[PDB]
Each structure stands twice: as structure tokens, then as C-alpha cells.
Amino acid sequence: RERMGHIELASPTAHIWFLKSLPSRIGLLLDMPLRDIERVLYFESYVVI
């Protein structure tokens, strides 16, 4: 009842709780609108690093 498992994701995935819950923590931290974050997250537009 207490031992938990873990799954090693092939690629990193963003946390939905820290993304869609307004205000977006990731978007507020990165000084970019939520629309751009959603676009880059779901493979819609490249973002420069």
C-alpha cells in the first residue's frame, strides 16, 4: 500500500498542473504568453535556446 513505482519517460513531458492552472507558472517565469508556451510544448513552432 505504500511502495510506489516509476516510469522512465522516453522524452521529457511538461506538468499539466503547473501549465494550465492560471496563472501559468511556466509562462509567468519565462516572460512569454501562454499561447506561445502551448505552441512550443505541443510541437507547433520552434523556440530558440
Binding site: 505552441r39 505541443y42 510541437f43 507547433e44
Partner: protein
């Protein structure tokens, strides 16, 4: 004018979807891999579609619409990035055609 699109097909319906697309007079592409299989103890190679549930369809949206392709009785959906369906460059098509892994 004619362009390529990526299509996600239903499970176990790749051949039916391919035949339905061929009936619509569009170009269809799917990688084929020969892999040694058993099938009740006879030793040959079966054809398995590389990148399963993926089809590459060359057609013209003006000639026949996108939703018509989306509803060919066996096509699960379009591989769309954004509002509009994604466009695969011809270089990827050439790579897939020449590649025989």
C-alpha cells in the same frame, strides 16, 4: 500542386485504408519490412509496415477535399500540427522511398 500528408490509420486496417485511398485516385505510401516469421511452422518472411499506423498520402486538396480523406472508412485521423494538417517535405518522401532498412 499535389502535396504529401501524414495519416494515422486505425489498428489492423492499414490495407483497407490503403485500398480505399487508392479508390479515390490518390498516391499512397507505406514502408514495408520483410521479417522472418513462423505462421504455423513455415519459414519465410512476412511484410510488416514500418512505423505502424502511419500512411503517406500524396493528393491535391482542390481535387478532393481533406475531410473526404479523413472519412475513407478506415483512416483514424490526420497527423495535424496546429489547426491545419501538417505538410511533409518532399525530401522526407524521397528518403522514405529510397530507405530499405
Amino acid at each position: 500542386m499535389q502535396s504529401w500528408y501524414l495519416l494515422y490509420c486505425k489498428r489492423g486496417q492499414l490495407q483497407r485504408a490503403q485500398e480505399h485511398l487508392e479508390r479515390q485516385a490518390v498516391n499512397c505510401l507505406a514502408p514495408m519490412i520483410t521479417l522472418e516469421k513462423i505462421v504455423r511452422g513455415k519459414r519465410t518472411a512476412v511484410s510488416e509496415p514500418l512505423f505502424p499506423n502511419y500512411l503517406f498520402v500524396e493528393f491535391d486538396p482542390e481535387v478532393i477535399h481533406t475531410t473526404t480523406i479523413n472519412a475513407t472508412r478506415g483512416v483514424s485521423h490526420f497527423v495535424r500540427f496546429g489547426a491545419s494538417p501538417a505538410i511533409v517535405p518532399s525530401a522526407v518522401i524521397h528518403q522514405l522511398s529510397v530507405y530499405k532498412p
